[PDB]
Curated annotation (Swiss-Prot), chain C:
List of residues binding chlorophyll b 1: W5
Cofactor note: Binds at least 14 chlorophylls (8 Chl-a and 6 Chl-b) and carotenoids such as lutein and neoxanthin.
Positions of chlorophyll a 6 binding: H185
TM region positions: 50-70, 83-103
Binding-site residues for chlorophyll a 5, renumbered to this chain: K152, Q170
Residues where chlorophyll b 2 binds: R49, V92
Disulfide-linked positions: none
Organism expressing this protein natively: Pisum sativum
Protein purpose: The light-harvesting complex (LHC) functions as a light receptor, it captures and delivers excitation energy to photosystems with which it is closely associated. May channel protons produced in the catalytic Mn center of water oxidation into the thylakoid lumen.
Binding site for chlorophyll b 3: S86, E102
UniProt name for this protein: Chlorophyll a-b binding protein P4, chloroplastic
Residues that, per the record, bind chlorophyll a 1: F25, E44, R158
Lineage: Eukaryota, Viridiplantae, Streptophyta, Embryophyta, Tracheophyta
Length: 42, 154, 198, 208
């Protein structure tokens, strides 16, 4: 259990989790706010 | 307007592009039964197209003779949304990331085996440190003044 | 027991408990270095005081106007009004004066006690106080600057800084005044809320 | 706090894992994936199983009792599955934000208790009130144990806590049961019960 959390902390796994979260986030942002060349809220 | 451009709300070429795009998607739409799912998808792309061109027209983008938005990065206050404002947002996020990573490296540097935490992340420490990036500009400014930002005689 | 902003959580070691308003709250470690802690003590003092005055001058003229006792423009609409001087002139006045005063205060932050006397009148100096609490002419009623007095100054300052934040963001979303917002809420609270405001 | 070597296990004949000695209430030796293998995670998961158990018991009540009464000529309460869509005296979102604030307070103090046992027992306004519990997950005090049934001898507290955890496990399985039933079948759980009682050989999973 402790060893498994350790394995899940290793560089490639933490990287896939981190960038997968980041990708879902950016995808959803471009889903609710698509296109957009500018920051329109000023 | 600026640089000889014209607002995209006033550009014939811009409206011609919106027209030709929409008619193109409708040419694809004529092939499918209007109740079908490909039809609903092409309708969604059409609505998204209208939203796109209408938003570019609204927010004041200038167009070239090509009928396409051109960005004014000179700093002209009418166009800060095109670079300066997203640029400040970027610098905030990038400064956040780098400040947090630097905080982690400083935190593990006196460990008995530093490289050990560079290949296997100390996630509790990382979670403790991620939100320091929220105030990274004050922290880094204070470090610059205090002399903790730059290593001495390097 | 000096008070805990998070009950379970321990205090940072660098928050001794000798500072007024010390509830052990520095989760991002901004005040870990002591010079940072001094500077931020003065910063919290000045932001808190200006925030108290500002929140007052934004909220009370409005409630007076809405009651009808007086007629004063909204705090955000006060800028557009006509005055006996060009707003540019007003700005240059304000800038010159603040440029003098703030730099004297700053001289006290760096080298305490150094600016305590009138540079014009060599008499009429200030007594030796603590950085951020000038005595003498600045305390005509000669109140006792003790704990609980400073703690109340900091408490009202923090509540007023939060208050100001609420005023600007509120007015941004609602397009009205803060007391107008309070009336709208007290009207039908379960149906007049930031939920319905968005 | 009493080891129980010869306790009845979930898998008769099997050997219990060394981190389950029978001291915990509801210890049948079941952790085949070693999820409570280290003491820290077992502590955490004991609190988890407890909270899940209590929420699932309240939920089993809120599904099964009103569905059962409204199935009779007693109440008019709607189906638990669709109760979220209903319009109450205000919008559900603002109700939910209320919920996140107050529940956030309670869960926050419980949180401080797990991370720092005892540090959270005093009323931050009226200190003379306080809480009597000395074990995490069983806070005691006038609020959470007014009848005092919670402060008692060991072996009695082990009996009662075992009852609580077993009821809560059953209730977890039952709540998810009504969930997957209402998704699979088209009715409330009591209709599944009656339809099954009429023809148990046929009206089952395999009637669809
Ligand atoms: C110190 C804080 C400070 C803040 C928060 C503001 C905020 C504001 N000023 Mg203001 N001012 C401030 C200081 C000062 N102003 C002025 C002079 C003016 C003018 C002349 C005007 C404003 C106006 C405005 C408003 C712009 C509209 C807006 O934001 O809509 C959301 C806004 C609420 C404008 C206004 O009143 O718009 C209604 C305006 O015309 N201000 C001076 C003196 C030179 C100031 C000195 O400190
Ligand atoms: C343990 C808590 C909890 C659980 C297990 C559920 C489970 C459910 N809720 Mg709730 N809800 C819960 C809490 C809450 N809901 C709401 C507000 C809503 C709404 C507004 C809706 C639900 C709905 C639903 C159902 C969604 C259908 C689905 O996911 O199908 C797979 C589902 C059976 C939905 C529903 O009624 O579906 C028919 C729905 O629309 N809930 C609030 C805010 C007060 C809750 C607060 O705790
Ligand atoms: C190629 C040379 C050049 C340069 C360098 C500039 C530079 C600038 N121009 Mg100009 N421009 C140029 C050519 C140039 N221009 C030409 C040839 C034209 C003719 C077309 C124009 C016409 C033009 C116009 C009409 C205007 C400008 C404006 C501006 C300013 C906009 C940015 C600003 O307002 O401040 C910066 C804005 C901020 C909000 C500052 C905050 C950002 C912070 C400091 C960075 C964040 C970092 C981080 C968070 C903190 C750091 C921490 C650290 C201590 C570690 C800027 C200084 C505008 C201006 O004057 O603005 C008033 C404007 O009116 N430009
Ligand atoms: C300084 C304290 C304070 C007080 C008591 C109020 C009071 C009120 N706010 Mg405001 N607000 C505040 C701060 C405060 N706010 C801050 C700091 C912000 C910036 C995020 C906002 C931004 C805000 C928005 C966007 C809106 C309100 C709105 C409202 C009204 C309805 C409440 C609501 O809809 O959700 C409340 C919204 C919040 C953001 C709450 C944040 C306040 C924090 C949690 C401090 C309060 C905790 C404190 C210990 C409890 C009360 C203490 C008080 C007696 C001093 C209400 C009269 C609504 C309104 O104007 O009605 C039309 C609404 O749209 N507020
Ligand atoms: C340095 C090069 C670069 C830059 C400057 C951009 C810039 C941009 N691209 Mg592009 N792109 C690039 C390279 C680049 N791209 C490459 C290499 C590819 C191939 C993989 C693409 C493929 C691509 C596609 C397919 C699309 C874009 C889109 C966009 C726009 C999206 C803006 C957005 O996401 O909304 C705003 C996002 C945010 C504000 C997120 C930041 C907020 C954070 C997460 C939280 C902040 C908390 C405070 C943006 C202006 C999209 C677009 O619509 O263009 C107009 C789009 O459709 N890009
Ligand atoms: C500096 C501002 C600040 C902030 C950000 C917090 C934040 C918090 N406080 Mg604290 N507090 C503060 C100042 C602050 N406090 C001060 C100055 C005092 C002394 C008067 C206290 C004394 C105090 C006590 C006694 C308690 C808290 C608690 C809490 C937590 C409540 C969580 C909650 O409300 O549920 C959800 C909130 C939503 C908005 C949703 C929360 C994280 C409570 C807690 O949870 O303890 C673990 C607790 O019991 N506060
Ligand atoms: C630093 C704080 C501050 C600042 C920025 C202002 C700014 C202003 N006030 Mg306000 N006000 C404040 C605090 C403040 N007020 C406080 C603490 C109160 C009492 C709670 C008021 C009550 C108030 C009233 C009743 C009026 C103003 C008025 C004004 C405006 C006229 C300029 C002026 O005051 O003439 C010069 C100022 C001297 C002190 C001389 C101006 C924008 C007047 C106005 O609305 O103008 C149209 C107006 O009649 N203020
Ligand atoms: C059959 C389920 C069950 C059982 C056996 C227990 C057992 C126990 N609970 Mg628990 N609890 C339960 C359900 C249960 N609980 C539920 C559903 C919740 C969420 C509301 C909680 C939340 C909870 C808290 C917060 C606390 C306890 C405490 C206790 C201990 C105090 C002694 C006691 O009063 O026992 C219970 C005796 C019974 C006869 C069972 C109750 C049957 C009720 C009365 C039926 C009501 C029907 C319903 C209203 C319709 C004890 C070991 C307290 C403690 O440990 O004190 C230190 C404590 O603080 N429980
Ligand atoms: C100065 C100020 C407001 C001043 C307002 C003024 C003068 C108003 C002036 C006028 O109204 C008049 C009177 C008349 C009107 O007609 C015109 C205007 C112009 C409107 C607010 C400060 C407001 C300041 C605020 C809100 C500061 C908030 C800081 C926070 C919350 C920091 C918290 C933490 O930093 C700690 C402490 C520890 C870290 O580890 C973690 C984090 C969380 C980072
Ligand atoms: C089943 C469940 C969990 C099951 C977990 C299992 C089997 C894990 C087993 C193991 O891991 C161990 C232990 C050890 C490992 O080595 C091996 C395995 C095998 C992996 C949780 C349910 C948990 C269920 C919960 C918490 C239910 C709570 C219900 C609430 C709060 C109320 C909801 C409602 O209010 C609404 C929303 C609307 C109303 O109309 C109706 C009501 C019902 C009132």
């Amino acid at each position: 259990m402790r060893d498994l959390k350790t394995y899940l902390s290793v560089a490639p796994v933490a990287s896939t989790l981190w960038f997968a979260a980041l990708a879902g986030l950016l995808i959803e942002i471009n889903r609710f706010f698509p296109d957009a060349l500018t920051f329109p809220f000023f | 307007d600026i640089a000889g451009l014209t607002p995209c709300k006033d550009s014939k070429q811009f409206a011609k592009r919106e027209k030709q795009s929409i008619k193109k998607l409708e040419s694809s739409l004529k092939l499918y039964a209007p109740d079908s799912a490909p039809a609903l998808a092409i309708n969604a792309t059409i609505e998204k197209t209208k939203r796109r061109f209408d938003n570019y027209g609204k927010q004041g983008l200038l167009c070239g003779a090509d009928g396409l938005p051109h960005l004014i990065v000179s700093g002209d206050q009418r166009h800060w949304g095109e670079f300066i404002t997203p640029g400040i947002l970027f610098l905030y996020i990038a400064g956040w990331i780098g400040w947090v990573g630097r905080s982690y490296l400083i935190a593990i540097r006196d460990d008995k085996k530093p490289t050990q935490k560079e290949i296997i992340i100390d996630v509790p420490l990382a979670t403790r440190l991620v939100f320091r990036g929220f105030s990274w500009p004050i922290a880094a400014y204070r470090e610059l003044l205090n002399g903790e930002l730059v290593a001495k005689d390097v | 027991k000096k008070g805990e902003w998070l009950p379970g959580l321990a205090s940072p070691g660098y928050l001794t408990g000798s500072l007024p308003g010390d509830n052990g709250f520095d989760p991002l470690g901004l005040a870990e270095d002591p010079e940072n802690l001094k500077w931020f003590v003065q910063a919290e003092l000045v932001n808190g005081r200006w925030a108290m005055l500002g929140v007052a001058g934004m909220l009370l003229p409005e409630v007076f106007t809405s009651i009808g006792i007086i007629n004063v423009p909204k705090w955000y609409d006060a800028g557009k009004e006509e005055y006996f001087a060009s707003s540019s002139t007003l700005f240059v006045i304000e800038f010159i004066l603040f440029h003098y005063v703030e730099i004297r205060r700053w001289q006290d932050i760096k080298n305490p006690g150094s600016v305590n006397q009138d540079p014009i009148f060599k008499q009429y100096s200030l007594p030796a106080g603590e950085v951020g609490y000038p005595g003498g002419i600045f305390n005509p009623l000669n109140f006792a600057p003790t704990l609980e007095a400073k703690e109340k100054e900091i408490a009202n300052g923090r509540l007023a800084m939060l208050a100001f934040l609420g005023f600007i963001i509120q007015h941004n979303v609602t397009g009205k005044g803060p007391f107008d917002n309070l009336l709208q809420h007290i009207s039908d609270p379960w149906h007049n809320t930031i939920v319905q405001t968005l | 706090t009493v080891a129980e070597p010869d306790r009845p296990l979930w898998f008769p004949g099997s050997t219990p894992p060394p981190w389950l000695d029978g001291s915990l209430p509801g210890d049948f030796g079941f952790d085949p994936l070693g999820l409570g293998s280290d003491p820290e995670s077992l502590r955490w998961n004991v609190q988890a199983e407890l909270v899940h158990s209590r929420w699932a018991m309240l939920g089993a009540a809120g599904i099964f009792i009103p569905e059962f009464l409204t199935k009779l000529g007693i109440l008019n309460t709607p189906s638990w599955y669709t109760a979220g869509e209903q319009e109450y005296f205000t919008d559900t979102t603002t109700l939910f934000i209320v919920e996140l604030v107050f529940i956030g307070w309670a869960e926050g103090r419980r949180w401080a208790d797990i991370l720092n046992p005892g540090c959270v027992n005093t009323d931050p306004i009226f200190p003379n009130n306080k809480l009597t519990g000395t074990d995490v997950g069983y806070p005691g005090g006038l609020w959470f144990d007014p009848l005092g049934w919670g402060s008692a001898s060991p072996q009695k507290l082990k009996e009662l806590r075992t009852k609580e955890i077993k009821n809560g496990r059953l209730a977890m399985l039952a709540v998810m049961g009504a969930w997957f039933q209402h998704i699979y079948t088209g009715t409330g759980p009591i209709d599944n019960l009656f339809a099954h009682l009429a023809d148990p050989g046929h009206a089952t999973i395999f009637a669809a």
